[PDB]
Design a protein around this ligand. Structure first.
Ligand code: 6NT
Length: 300
């Protein structure tokens, strides 16, 4: 049974997965995504080192493939991350002039969003902007532009494609008592109060075993920021216990504004964390106990 169809029957928008051309053309990934998932993200092909490896030199073959495949197969598309410190080329992080970096950031945002205008449901505009203690991460954008870089990025994104839902995402938002979790909520409340167009908070849930349970308290805390949507991304769980995965799914079901969940790949061997066997399909492309547990859960 399709977890995406089953979650939609429970009133959510999607169960999605990260993918890209060479997953689509090998294994059983295309078959599983067609049957079982309702949304795709580019696993790597939309990151800055993939899309703008030198200034103004845009590389879109990878991302085009993904977007075209999704459209042909009636799948929603999420994409990201436009502004974060990972996968960022040296030419960007060596910029020291503030107006230059502002316009470099704006051109990156606008060129990518314009190319796919109208085709992308959700854009992760800003990513990993927080330190663990809740202060803003001192990436090149904060160091050169200052904290205005976040509102600027969001405004720029809303102008480029007003149809897209715009998200901020971060990791280690999995415990309601962790300082980072309350901090992003506080700053999102304040940005939105000031007219900054943040439609969603995305929680990057690269989890260790046993961490699923805590998401049942953390996700409602994130939703208290008052964004129209929240979501779960990059989900994987070391060991892939049915208990962890079902807890995450149920957190989504519990939180009215949570639109869905995206897993960090289809089958274990294609995970960055393969030895932890953290995904829902195994190396032979069979649905694992966690997949079947999610099915049972989703089936007062
Ligand atoms: O949820 N995801 O797996 C995922 C993968 C890559 C991304 N880039 N921006 N947001 C993303 C989400």
């Amino acid at each position: 049974q399709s977890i995406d169809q089953l979650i939609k029957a429970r009133g959510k928008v999607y169960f999605g997965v990260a993918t890209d051309q060479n997953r689509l053309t090998t294994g059983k990934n295309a078959a599983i995504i067609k049957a079982d998932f309702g949304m795709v993200w580019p696993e790597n092909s939309m990151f800055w080192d993939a899309t703008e490896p030198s200034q103004g030199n845009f590389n879109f073959a990878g991302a085009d493939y993904l977007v075209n495949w999704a459209q042909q197969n009636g799948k929603l598309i999420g994409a990201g991350c436009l502004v974060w410190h990972n996968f960022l080329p040296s030419w960007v992080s060596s910029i020291t002039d503030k107006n230059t970096l502002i316009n470099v950031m704006k051109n990156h945002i606008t060129t990518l969003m314009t190319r796919y205008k109208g085709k992308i449901r959700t854009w992760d505009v800003v990513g990993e902007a927080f330190n663990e203690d809740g202060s803003l991460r001192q990436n090149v954008f904060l160091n050169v532009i200052g904290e205005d870089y976040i509102p600027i990025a969001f405004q720029t994104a809303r102008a480029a494609d007003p149809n897209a839902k715009l998200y901020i995402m971060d990791y280690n938002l999995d415990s309601a008592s962790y300082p980072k979790t309350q901090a992003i909520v506080n700053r999102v409340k304040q940005w939105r109060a000031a007219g900054v167009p943040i439609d969603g908070i995305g929680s990057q849930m690269h989890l260790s075993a046993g961490q699923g349970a805590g998401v049942l308290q953390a996700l409602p805390l994130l939703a208290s920021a008052g964004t129209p949507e929240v979501s779960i991304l990059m989900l994987d769980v070391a060991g892939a216990s049915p208990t962890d995965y079902v807890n995450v799914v149920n957190a989504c079901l519990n939180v009215q504004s949570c639109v869905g969940i995206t897993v960090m790949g289809v089958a274990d061997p294609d995970s960055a964390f393969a030895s932890s066997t953290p995904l829902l399909f195994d190396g032979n492309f069979n649905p694992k106990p966690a997949y079947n547990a999610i099915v049972q859960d989703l089936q007062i």
